[PDB]
Structure formats: structure tokens, C-alpha cells
Amino acid sequence: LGDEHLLGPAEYISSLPSKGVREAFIDGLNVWLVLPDHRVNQLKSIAQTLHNASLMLDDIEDHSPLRRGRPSTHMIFGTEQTINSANFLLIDVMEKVRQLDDPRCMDIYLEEMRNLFIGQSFDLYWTRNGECPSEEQYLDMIRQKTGGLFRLLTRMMVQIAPVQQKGLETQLASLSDVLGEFFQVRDDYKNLTELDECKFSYPLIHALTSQPKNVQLRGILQQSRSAGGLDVPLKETVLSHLRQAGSIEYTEAKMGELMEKITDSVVSLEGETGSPNWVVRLLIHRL
Amino acid sequence: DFILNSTLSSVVERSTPDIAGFCSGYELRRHHHEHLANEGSLRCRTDWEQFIGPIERWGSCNPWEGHFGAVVLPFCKPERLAVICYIFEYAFLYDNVVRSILGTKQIQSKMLLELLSIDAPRAEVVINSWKEMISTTAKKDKTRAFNNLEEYVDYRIIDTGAPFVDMLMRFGMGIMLTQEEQKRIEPIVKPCYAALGLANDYFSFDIEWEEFQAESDKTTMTNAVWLFMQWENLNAEQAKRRVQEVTKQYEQQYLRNIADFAAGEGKENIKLQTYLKAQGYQVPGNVAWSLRCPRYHPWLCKEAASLLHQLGDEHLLGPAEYISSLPSKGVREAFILPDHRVNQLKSIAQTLHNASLMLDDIEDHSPLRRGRPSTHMIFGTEQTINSANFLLIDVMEKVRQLDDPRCMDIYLEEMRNLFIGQSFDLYWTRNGECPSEEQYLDMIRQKTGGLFRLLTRMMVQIAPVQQKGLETQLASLSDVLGEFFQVRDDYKNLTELDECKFSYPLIHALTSQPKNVQLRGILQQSRSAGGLDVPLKETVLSHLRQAGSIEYTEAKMGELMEKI
Amino acid sequence: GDEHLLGPAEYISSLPSKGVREAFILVLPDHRVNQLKSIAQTLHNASLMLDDIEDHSPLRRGRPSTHMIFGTEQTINSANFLLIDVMEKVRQLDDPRCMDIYLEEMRNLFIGQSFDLYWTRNGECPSEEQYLDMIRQKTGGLFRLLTRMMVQIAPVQQKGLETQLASLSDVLGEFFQVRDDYKNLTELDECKFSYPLIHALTSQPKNVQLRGILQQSRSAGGLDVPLKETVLSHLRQAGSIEYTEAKMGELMEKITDS
Amino acid sequence: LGDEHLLGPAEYISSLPSKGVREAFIDGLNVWLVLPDHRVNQLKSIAQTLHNASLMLDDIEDHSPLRRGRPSTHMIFGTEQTINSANFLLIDVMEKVRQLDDPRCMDIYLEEMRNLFIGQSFDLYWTRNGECPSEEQYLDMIRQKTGGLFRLLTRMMVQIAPVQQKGLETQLASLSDVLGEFFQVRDDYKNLTELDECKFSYPLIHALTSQPKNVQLRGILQQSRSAGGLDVPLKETVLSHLRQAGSIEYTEAKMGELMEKITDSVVSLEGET
Amino acid sequence: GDEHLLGPAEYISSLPSKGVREAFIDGLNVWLVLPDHRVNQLKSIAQTLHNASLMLDDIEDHSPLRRGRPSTHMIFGTEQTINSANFLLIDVMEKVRQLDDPRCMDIYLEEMRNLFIGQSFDLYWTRNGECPSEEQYLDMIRQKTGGLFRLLTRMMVQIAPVQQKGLETQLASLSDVLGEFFQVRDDYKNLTELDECKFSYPLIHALTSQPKNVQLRGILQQSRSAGGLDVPLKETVLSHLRQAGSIEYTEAKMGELMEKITDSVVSLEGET
Amino acid sequence: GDEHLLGPAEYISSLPSKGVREAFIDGLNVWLVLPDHRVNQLKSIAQTLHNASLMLDDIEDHSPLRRGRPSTHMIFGTEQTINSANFLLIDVMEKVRQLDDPRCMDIYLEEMRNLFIGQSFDLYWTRNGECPSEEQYLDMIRQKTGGLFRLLTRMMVQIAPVQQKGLETQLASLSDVLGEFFQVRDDYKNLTELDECKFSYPLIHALTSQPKNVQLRGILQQSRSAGGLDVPLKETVLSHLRQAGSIEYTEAKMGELMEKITDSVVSLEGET
């Protein structure tokens, strides 16, 4: 009895195409924080493992048969094996945080994993019960769910960073939160403009709030919940109801405001530190 | 939109049909905005010094004949030119070497931002050809020996970056082309890349040979002159004429090549005609620049500079309190020093057991626990999984409150063993595989004896010194006790299947009788349908009683108790 | 012919019945009373025929339901013709003002049933006022219809007492529904809200166990026995079985007063 | 309290594309029966509401996910809500026939609705229990199920017709009956030449009657009933079985005869007027 | 390896039986008087054929249980059970040739052809929901159920020592009547003392006498739609059947068949 | 009548076919020199047996289509198709008895025993998800697929007019190699350009050469449980096979079998 059947689901999701947002975020924060390549690689490994475990778990709780155009992990190893592997990967990550040689890096891990799980709990509750949240309740959840890994990486980086640069944490954390919000709203737009699992999104809440009497949209959102999915004509009908409440332009306004905030925070940090980053300005032009 | 604009550059007159014995029949042009080209290269020189270090080897500037991209890319648009020449200067110094990592990534991103801000689709093509070149150069042995010219040429096509420069020309031309035409043109353009590469070998040889004779650690070189040494051993200057001729064949090779396309679509396909005609313009530019570039002749470098100078946890702690409220028969607390330490260890054991039970009920599809409904029937499957994932993190903090550095590692290693055991159990349950007796007994030493070993190894660490040797004995006792619990649970469930779980009696039944098809068929029916009904369960028990596998189990229970 | 149209209607009219509607049925001549009893009978039969389909109930009075002997579609068609036949029956009563009474009361009944069906399907819990207004139309609509039709064809005199009798009918229907809520859990398979359930979910805004069990019931087609007992325990702890008996007493008090 | 959940399925199907046959029929009848515009609009509303209710109900009892390329009413609101809204539209129309200022218009409504329900009941029986009707039996079912609305509109249109014109009653009833038969034979022919719910048709009865020993067709007609629907390869086999028996030519001949009757009736009616 | 082939064939043999075929074989041996080894051979043939028929019938009716114990296709699967049932016919081909008579083969093949025709009509009426007439139903169960008895008796008359051969038509008639009686008995017992939509003798009478009973016809179709009926609907069917005298019309058939059996047996003693 | 018994058989006979059996018989006839009437009888036997085999296989494989046309059990049902296949097996026994040879039945019975044994092993491996060895797989496919060829060969040699002394073992070896080649060819064709979880030479080589490829085994179990592999999973299986080198192994086996085929044909040509 040694290994395999445990790391197998973990290795399958690692050998898959990936954009590399979090690794580039770490490498762009290193320009401001200046860390040895050893520590940067360790943090990158931590981030990679965490993201892989998150994707493993989120694919099971979306009934998604495919990922990146390739079969998901639970369609090759079973749901129970994937759950076991994703459970182990959190123990494996805490073996890496301890190798960063700091007692204060464990408290950060154990205090932001709490926030990640709290956000995902509300997401799952809303999805299962079919209860529409408010805009505040939805924006505070995605700031604690999609912007939790970024906050982990930030607050750990500004802890191993050689003394001096510790007053940058507040701005560097506001940047992480606004980036998480931007990344969630961007995906929400991309899926819609260019609900089968009954996942709420920023466009949908505006539609269900502005029109408290649209009995047609709420009927399709229940047909999806009962039948288990929306076929193409019903998806077209839903996408059409969102182009009459102005829910594809409200999202654009939010996206523009968020990007303005990101640009302003980057400029403030670049005026406080020195020469242009040029590495956080490229992950922005790629949105 | 597919016609080359001749007003952007003017033809350069030459008195001889060839250029130093090269490029007969080619016509040379020089761009009309050389003032823009020099700006980009000087920017890279300033930035490279700021971010990386000082330079010495000169680059692409040549004051007498003109800029590299000027003579090599004579039809580039004026608005795209400065960025184009910026990349060329980078390519020169990057090849040389191949805070430092910061400057390298900052500069790799300053220019890769200019490219993607100008033309998103075509800049998407160029970066792969770059990535392909840097990957291929590093992944190819520089000590590799080349047996023939054809073998070397295939290496040299990607080494000198002729496709990379080709991608650059398309970006400077606004020419976008599909995949289908690409398969048409590789044999057409293949001689051109050889001509470009060999000329670079021929002209750069003198300084490279000087670098050779300076560098005594040299393996086989990537160089036509030096590699022709192996095949037709002779004098370098005489070889230069030989190198002159073999390249000169390629000078007219691609020149003629076109015919192939011209015959096919070189009379109607204007887009490829202009593309393959511009590709013909590359060969003369390289030699004209390479006649007198500072990149090969360091002695004019001083002279060259002279002229050039002018909300809440209510849905997270929802399944974690329901499973902690159902009736319990606690045997782990009984297995468990100061009072508060014992209470902390009992809390840890309780939380770990609750998480294990929550996960176990899902992977058994059991709708009932202690007569009461299961956790995933009150809170769903996904929420229970999410809470079972935070229970580990919650236990993780409780361990740290038992202040000791070494209680951390014990927890991590013990949980690794638990997960390995559970993974083997799950693999055997799903992929219809009957384990051996040794494999089954070793699996239950980790999946079931893991918690006991964890608690014991923590309490021996927390305990006030005194007890020294009571580590091996207690651990062995914990392993045998977990085995006894698992075998007992296997015995109780049968004498006084619905999820296809292998038990201790069942393994004996399937092993002692290698030919019993009824038991295996009923097991497969359980696998397929989902569970077994009462008559089939009675059939299974009858088979087990006939096989004498129920008294084989009681021998294990009595023997395990004797060890305890 | 008419064998495949009158089939389900004949079958549902042969099952044993409580006959409260006929007992409910002003000095009127006998033939008018028989006519009104026939109207009430066929209307209740159509209501039961449609309700059995919208609740997936295999059994009615222990005996099989109509849609398990004739099919869903034929039962629906027979119910529609049952409404048409009630229309024909009211016509034979020969009174021009009963026409509007019947149409208005039918509209109210359909509104009430529409709200009930929307709440059941979409998993939206109404408030106390909304629930107590829906059951004044879905269940008290028949009593109000019969009372308003009975008053009009009564010899003069009894004409100013229409309001009193209508209030009595509404409160009576409310009493029947609140009783049927009590004697259904103190003695969910279709995720039907009730008075105790509304009290439980309103008084406790953070009880996630009850809401989770209800959601499990929704995407299962019904609850099995242990979870039903869990729901009963939650209601009995919340004090909703006793909050219902206060409504039942208050309604009976108003019945006595009215 | 409100109407948003009652008049939601009714309004959804009333915002869909339509052909307008039932309204062009009223417009065409208005020539021989000169009528005020207000009454014509009332009757058009009546016909539209009845057609909408019929379409709403015949989509639940056909397990049809889509209608005119757009999602059906029961896939947006639910089966029970659609049924509840459809049984209310019968009451709503019953208030509109009452606004035509004629006691006799209610009897016509109450009789033709009975005939429509009888026809639909027989069709539902033959669909549920896979019992093949005779050609005559099928031709009497569709003279009520489909021609019922036309007859209903016609007989409630010669009643408000200003005096004089009452003699053109039987002729128009025959015209409506032939129109109802034709509009169903045409739909069967279009559906075939250009069974998923196991519905009989005029071409499919001739095949089962002329060939009493065709065991292949009678088993493909049962696979659809059992599984729930036929695949394309089985549909091709059914079409090939029907083509060899000459059923399509029989359908074309019936269509031709029906159109001859329609033109004869029209020429006679314009002759009288 | 004859282990995944003979497997299902031994499970169905291990199960308890009633031994009606063996008793029938013993029954006609007093009149036909033939040696013991041939009797054992014939009994083995009959046992194998009956086992194959039961194995195939259990699959074609979705019966999880048989004799209280689980069916063969719930221990070995459907495909292996079909394979073993198909091999049992080939095994019976081997068994018949050892009887040392060329005509036994022709008799066997003809009887199996009749048996398969009867079973085919049964399956067609079950799947398509077509109610047979009384004549068609009695013709079918005369071949499907009386086929084995006719096979055995026609082989017995051939094997038996010379002399008695004119008593072959009488015994064939006896076998047909006995099979008919057995099938009607099974129908009556299953009714008084159609989860797979089976047409029985009592049900045909009810469906013929009352050509307008929509309730029974709708319950029969719900059976098809749901693949079985629950207890209340079965009670409804039983009530419908005893309001048309379909239980009292079956006892008359049983009594007439028993009278015919008694007369045939008596006549079979006056020539012997 | 036999409209419900002979229905499925006629339907599957009407379907387009390749004609491998008839061509093989015609090819052997040049060496054996049988009269035309016997050759047509043998072609009829081969056609009936092949049609019955396909009828049974389509049911036991959950194949909804055959040659791009609806399968027999999708037009007549499972039970009727099973009954028709059993009657087809019984029918062939009436055809092999018109060959005027007592020895022509022993061959039929023994080759049918071998055929059923092979099919039983295939069914057991498919249902239980057990991977056979290459030796076991090749032994099996030598009997299931090389069964009809061997049966036809042996019967032709028995009926062959006089002579034909040594030409029995060589022809049986040819038949076995031919059946093996056909099965491997079908395997290669199906894979190159799992729904029922059927094992194959490329798949066995993969599962044996890689004793720790968990991904392939997981995808196979997903196919077993779900009921079939949707397209990207099948491409993943093909990628695993290409990585393991199974396709080249299959091609080598194909070539090595064709060498024996050529040598056997050369030798038999040389003798005759």
C-alpha cells in the first residue's frame, strides 16, 4: 500500500491546459516585494495545488462532465476518489506552508481558508435552495470566494518579504479583493453574452430585482432547477429576457468601475514604490 | 489590400549583378523612415542597462548601409516599425547571455505589451514562434554531431529564427493567413531559411571562430564552416568559397522555387504571391546589412559610433452540528496528563470522527444513521462535502493549541496514512477488485487504526516526560485494536453487500473457492443493479456458511483479542 | 358516442364521499335544492379530479385515483367538460343573475388555485396574510358560490342577509382548510405549505434543518418516514401545532359570532 | 390576490407567431353575412381565445417540448399552472359569448363545445390504447375535433347576421365540416411526407388496413409507444412502409376530392347570393 | 471450460420442482410397458426441456423470483442465461439420438416447431396489447403447454415394444386436453388464490362480454405503461372480473376438461 | 401461422450482408469439388446460422442499429427475437439432416458446443469486467468466430465426393487462422477509425503492458457503470492506446496471421 489512487486524480488535473493567472499575479507582486526565487517557487506551488483542489471540488458540485474541453476528474476516477484526493491536497498544502519557515504563515492560511469556505457555503446554499441573493450579498460572497486565494498569496508574500515593506499590505489586499470581484464578474459576463446548474450571476440579480413581476424568467429558472438543465431554446429565451432589463449593460458599468479601481490602486502603489511595474500592467491588458 | 506599397521604400542601386558573390538577381531596398528604426533599438539599450546590466557586443545599428530591419524588412508599415526593431535588439542580446530575474521579466513584459496593444490577432501568432524557437534551441544538444548537410539544415532553420522573422514580417505587413496555405508553403520557403542561415554562418564565422579559438571548452559548434570540417576536411578560406557555393545554390534555390507556387496559384492568388514575393526580399537584405555590420566587425565599432552619434458561519457549521448531535457510542474518547489537555484531545478525536462519518455516509449512499436521517439528506451532498473539508482545517487549529511543534507532523503523517488507506478501499469497492487477505488487513490498519495511532502518538508527546519506551508498544496495540474493530464490524454485519463492500469472510469465500460462479454473479448483480434484495442476501449467506468462511472469521477475532 | 368523456366523471362520482357540500345546502322548493346539490356535486368532483393530478396521488379514499384508471389527458378533458356541464346545469336554473355569480366565483377560485400552484412549484413560502387570503378563495369559493346562488332564487325577504352568509361561508372554508392542515401532521410529500409550516419558518429565520428537509423533499418527489418525523419534531418544538389550535379556536369563535 | 399567475400562460401563448386561419375564415364569412365591425372583432377574440386554449392543452397531452420553434407553455410555467390557466379561458370566453346580446348564442357554444370534447376524448382514447380506428371513425372524429371551432363560429355568426340571411346555414355548416376535414388531412400529409407520440393519421390507417399481416410496421408502432418516441432510422422505415402500400397517393386523392367539394360549395353559395 | 455454460443450467435444476412431467412419463408406462433405462432417458429429456423453458420464461416475464428463490438471470445475467438455454436445445439433440430411432428426431423437431409457434403467438399478444378470442387462446395454450406432453407421448409410443401402436391418437388427445387443463388451472389459481400484461381465460370473457367497460381496459393499459400493477388496482380488476361471471365461467371449463380427461382415461382402459 | 415466428428471421435475412461465408464455401469447393445442390444447401445452413448469431449478438450487446438500419429487437422486441433465434437453431437441424449423412450431425453438435463455450467466456468477461490474457483471448476467439468456418469445413469434407483423405487438418488450421484474423481485423477497424465494455487485443495489450495505468481502468469502469463512453472519453482511451503502443502490436499480429494464411494456402495448393 503506497500512494496512487490518491495522487492520480491530483495528477490528472495538473496535466491540463491552464492560463496561469495566479502564478503571473505572484510574479507581478514580486516586483514590488522582491523575494528569492526559491520562496517564489514555493508560493507558486502552494497556489497551484490550492487552485487544483478547488477546481476538483467545484466540478463535482456542478455536475459538469467536461473541463477545458477534456473529461473531468470525477468522470475518470469516480466522485468518492476525487473527493478523497481533494481532501488530501489540503493536508499536503499545510506541509508546504510549514516549510516557509514562519509561524505566522499558518495563522493566515487557517484564517482565510475559513473565509473561502464561508463564501462557498453561501454559494452552495443559494444554488440548492434557489434563493436569489441581493447585490450586496452576492458581491460580498464573491469577494470572499474568488478573492480568497489572492488574499492568501498577498498576505503570505508581505510576510516573507524582507522587513521594510509591511505597510503595503492594506493597498495590496484591497487590490486582491477588487481583482477577485473583477474576475468573477468577467466570467459571469463571458458565460452569458457569448444557468443549467441554476447558478446565480450579476446579470441575473439585476433582472430579478428590477422586474419583481416577471413570472416568465422565474419559471425558466425553476424548469432548470427541476429538469436539471436548460435546452438551447430556453437558454435563448433567458438570454433575451436579460437584454430587455438592461442587465448586459449594468454588468458593463460594474466592469468599468472595477477596472478604474484597479488602475487607480496600481498607480497609487507605483507612485509609492517607484519605477513602473510593467508586469501587473500586462495581466490587466489581458483582463 | 494585398499589394505591396512601393512608396514606403526605394530601390538601392548596385553596379554588380551579385553582392560580394551573393544574391545575383535580387533587388535591394531601404525604407523611407530610418529615423524611426534607430529609435527603437536605442530604447532597448537604455532599458537593458537600467534593468539588467551593461552591454558590449553591438547590435542591429549600422550607419553606412542601414538598420537590420530596414534592409531586411523594407515594406513594413510606418506605425508598426519602432516596435518591430525593438524586438530585434532584444533578440540579439538575449541570445548573447543564453535583480536579474526582475529586469528580465519586466523587459519581457514592456515589449510584449507594445505588441499586444497594436494588433491583438497577429501578435498572438508571433509569440508562439518565439516560444518554439527558445524551446527548440534549449532542448537540442549543442554537442550533437551532424552527419550531412540536410540534417544540419533542419536544425538551422529553427535556430536562426527565419520563421520567427517571417512571423515578424507578416505583422509588419498586416498579412494574416490560414492553416491550409501553411502546409502548401513550407517546402517552398524551406530553401530560403537555409539560405538565410548559411549566410549568417558564413558571415558571422570570423568573429564566431575568434570566439571559438578564445573558448577552449568548445564541443561541436553549430556552424556550417566548422561542421563541413567533419565531411570534407580542408582549409577554412578555401571552405569559405565552398560555403559560398553551397549557399549560392540556395540563393537561386528559393529564387527559382517560387515557380512551384507560381505554376500552381502564382498567377491568381495575389495574397500568397505578394507574401512569397516579399519573402524573396529577405535574402538580399541580410547580406547587405551583414557586409559591414558592427555585430561581426568590432574594429569599426568606435568609428561606427562617430557618425551614428549625430456573511456568517451558519451554512458552514450546519452539517457539523447535526452529525455531532446524533447518539454516539464513543469508543475513541474512552481510548483517551492534565485535564484540559485530555479534553482538547477528546475534542480533536470527536471532530475527526464526525468528519470521517460525514464523508463515509456519502460514499455508501446510506440514507440513515443511528435510525435517524443521514446528513446529506438534511443539508445536501455538496454542503456536507464543504463542511467535511473545513472540519479538517478546524481540527488543524485545535492541534496547534496543544502547544508542541511535533504534534503538527504527527497529525500530518497520520492523516496521509488515513487517506492512503481510504483510497485503496474506494478503489477496491468501485473497480470490482477482490483484494488479498494481506492487502485487506493492511488497508484496515490505516483506515481504521489511523485515528487510534494519531491520538496515541499525540498523547505520548504531550505526556509529562516519565514514560519513555511506551511508544512502540502502544502503537502496536492501537493497530491491532483497529483491526479487531474492523473485523468485528465485518462479522456483525452478516451473521446478525448493498454497496459492494469486500469483507473479511467474503475474501475467504471468493479465494478458497476459485470456481464458484454463483457468488460472483450475485456480487456483480449487486454492482450493476445497485443493491441486493433479501433472497439474494440469504443466498450469499448460505454460500458463506457452506464455504466455512464465517468460522474463519471467528478464528481471526479470537486470535486478534489474544494479541490485545 | 360519450363513453370516453363521461367515464372519469362517472368513476369519481361513485367513490364514497363525505357530502359536506350537500349538507351545507332561504325557503327554497325541493327541485331547486336538488339542482343546486347536483351543481355542487359535479363541481367538487371536477375539483378533486384536477387536484389528484396536481399532487401525484395514486390513492383516493383508499381506492385508486381517476388518472390511474383512465389516464391524465382523459381526466383533464373530462374535467373541462365537467365545467361545461356545470354551465349547462346553471342554465337550466333559469335565472339571468346566477350567470354572473357563477362566472365571478369561478374567476376567484381559479385565482386562488393559481397562487397555490405557484407557491408549491417555486418553493416560495407565503406569509400568514397571503395564505389566509388564498384559502378564502380556493376552498371557500364553492360555499360562497352556492350561498350567492341560493339567496337569489329564494323568495324575496331573505335578500339583505347575503353579506352575513357570505362572511360565514368564507370563515367556514378557512376553518376547513386550517383543520385539514392540523389533521395531516398531528395524526409535505408534494411540498405543500401549511399553517404550522408557515409559522415554523417565520418564527425561526435561521432554522436550516427544516429548510433543508423541505428542499430535499422538493427534489425527491416526497419525504420518507424518518424525515417526516424530523419535520414533526421541528414543528412541535417551534410551537406550531399549538399555534394552529389557537387559530382553530378563533375561527370557531367567529363562526359562533357570525 | 392578483392575476399575474392566472393570465401568464394565457398571455405567453398569445404573444407567439400565428397563421390566422380562424380569423381569415371569419373575414371571409363576413361577405355573405354582412356584420358590424364591433361584432366581428368580438368573434375574432372569441376564436383566438378558444384556439389558444386548445393549443395550450394539446401540447401537454402530446409531450411536445417546442411549439413553432419556441418553448411551449408548460415548459415555462408548469403543467398544473398551464392546465389551471386553460380551464379559466373557457370561463373567460363564456363571458364574451354573453356580451353578444343573444340567448341563443349560449346554446350554440354549449353544444359545439360538447362535440369538440367528444372528438378529443375519442382521439385521446385511440392514442392511449393503441387501437386503430376505421377510416370512417377517423373521419367522424376530425369533423368535430377540428371542424368544431369553424362550426361554432359559423352558427354564432348567422345568429347576429342582420335579418334576411338565414337560409345559408346548412351550406355554411357543410363548408365548415369539409374545411375541418381538409385542414387535418393536409397536416397529416405535411407531417409525413416532409408518430413520435404514437398518433394515428389518414395515411397510417390505410397501411394498417390494406396490409393486415405487416408485422414490421405494427412493431415499429409499438416501439414508439413503449420507449416514448421513434428515432430517425425508424421514421425512415415507417415512411418506406407507407410508400410501398400506396398510402400517400390515397391521401392525395382524398385531398383532391375534399378541395373539389370546397369549390363546389363555394360556387353554390356565391350562386345563391 | 464448460463452467459459464452449464452454470445457469445447474442452478435451475437445483431448485425444488413438482415432478409433473416425470409422473406423466410414469403414467403412460403402464399401458406402453417399456424398459427402465429408456424411461430414465425420456425423463432426462423432459427435465432438460422444462428447465430450458423455465429459464427463458423467467427472462421474458421479468420475474425476480422462482420457487421463492431467486431466478437464474439474477445470478448469472440475462445474456448467459439465454446462452445456456440455447445450448440446452443442442444437448437435448444429443440426448434424443441415444434413443436409437430415426423417427424420434422428426417427432422432436415437429413438436418443437409447434411449441415455438405457440410461444410466438403468446409473445405477440402480450407485447402489442391485443386481446385474443377464446378460440385463438385455446389453440395457443394447446401447443405451448401441451407440446411437451405430446412430444413425450409420441416418443413413448415409438420406443415402446412393438404391438400397441394404434393407441397414439387417443394419447395425443389426452395430452392436449391435459395441457389445456393445466393452463386453465394456472390461470384460475393466479387469479383467485397481470403484472407483465398477460391475457388469461377469465380476462378474455370479461373483455368480450362487456365491449364497453372502459375501467378494466384502462387498468390493463396502466399495467403496460407502468410495467406492473399495485395491490388496489389488482383488487379492482378482481372485482371487475367477478361482476361479469368470469370466475364462474372458468370453473365450468375446468369441469368439462376433467370430464373429458376421465372419459379419455376410461376409454384407454377398454382397449387394454 | 408462422408470421410471428419467422418475422425476425426474414427481416434480418433481408438486410444487406457481406457474404464471407458463401465466398469461403465457394473457395473451398474448388479443392473439394462438391455438386452444386450440396453447395447451396451448405450456403443456406451458413446463412441461417450467421443470421441467428447476429440476432442474438445485437440483443446481448445493446446495439440499437445494424448496418445503419434498425436492429431486429427494435422492430419485434427482445422476446420475439430470442424465440425466432431458437427456432432458427432448431431449423438448421432439419437442414443438416437432408445432407444424407449420419456423421454430419455429430460435427454440427460438437462445433455448436464449442461455439457456445466461447460465447459464454466472452459474456462472463464482459459482464464481470475481468481482463483475460492474450492466450485466453486468442483461445476464445478461435472458437466463437472460427466455429462456423470449422463446422462448414468439416461438413464439406464429409460430403466431399470420395478422395479428400489428408485435406482435413490443414483446412481446419486454415479456418482457425481465418477466424482469428477476422476478429483481430474487426478489433483494429473499430478502434482506429468500449460502449458495451468489450475487451480487445489492443485493450488487453494496454492493460497488461501498463500494470499501473489507473486512468484507463477508471475510464473503462465509467463505461461499465454509465453504460457507454461519450466521445472525449473515447479519444482519451485512443490516446492511451497510442501511448502504450497497442496499435502497432495489433498490426504485427495481423501480419503474422496473414503469413500463416498464405503459407497454408500455398501448401494446400501444392498438395492438390
UniProtKB/Swiss-Prot annotation, chain C:
Residues 1-258 are annotated as: Prenyltransferase. A motif (DDXXD 2) lies at residues 51-55. Dimethylallyl diphosphate binds at residues 60, 138-139, 177, 184, 192. Disulfide bonds: none annotated. Isopentenyl diphosphate binds at residues 18, 21, 44, 61. It comes from the Eukaryota. Mg(2+) 4 binds at residues 51, 55. Mg(2+) 3 binds at residues 51, 55. In the N-terminal section; belongs to the terpene synthase family. In the C-terminal section; belongs to the FPP/GGPP synthase family. Hexamer. Bifunctional terpene synthase that converts dimethylallyl diphosphate (DMAPP) and isopentenyl diphosphate (IPP) into variediene as a single product. The C-terminal prenyltransferase (PT) domain of EvVS catalyzes formation of geranylgeranyl pyrophosphate (GGPP), whereas the N-terminal terpene cyclase (TC) domain catalyzes the cyclization of GGPP to variediene. The PT domain can also synthesize geranylfarnesyl pyrophosphate (GFPP) from the C5 isoprene units in vitro, while the TC domain is able to cyclize GFPP to the sesterterpene (2E)-alpha-cericerene. The conserved DDXXD motifs as well as the NSE/DTE motif are important for the catalytic activity, presumably through binding to Mg(2+). This is Variediene synthase. It comes from Emericella variicolor (Aspergillus stellatus).
From Swiss-Prot, chain D:
Mg(2+) 3 binds at residues 58, 62. A motif (DDXXD 2) lies at residues 58-62. Dimethylallyl diphosphate binds at residues 67, 145-146, 184, 191, 199. Mg(2+) 4 binds at residues 58, 62. The conserved DDXXD motifs as well as the NSE/DTE motif are important for the catalytic activity, presumably through binding to Mg(2+). In the N-terminal section; belongs to the terpene synthase family. In the C-terminal section; belongs to the FPP/GGPP synthase family. Hexamer. Bifunctional terpene synthase that converts dimethylallyl diphosphate (DMAPP) and isopentenyl diphosphate (IPP) into variediene as a single product. The C-terminal prenyltransferase (PT) domain of EvVS catalyzes formation of geranylgeranyl pyrophosphate (GGPP), whereas the N-terminal terpene cyclase (TC) domain catalyzes the cyclization of GGPP to variediene. The PT domain can also synthesize geranylfarnesyl pyrophosphate (GFPP) from the C5 isoprene units in vitro, while the TC domain is able to cyclize GFPP to the sesterterpene (2E)-alpha-cericerene. This is Variediene synthase. It comes from Emericella variicolor (Aspergillus stellatus).
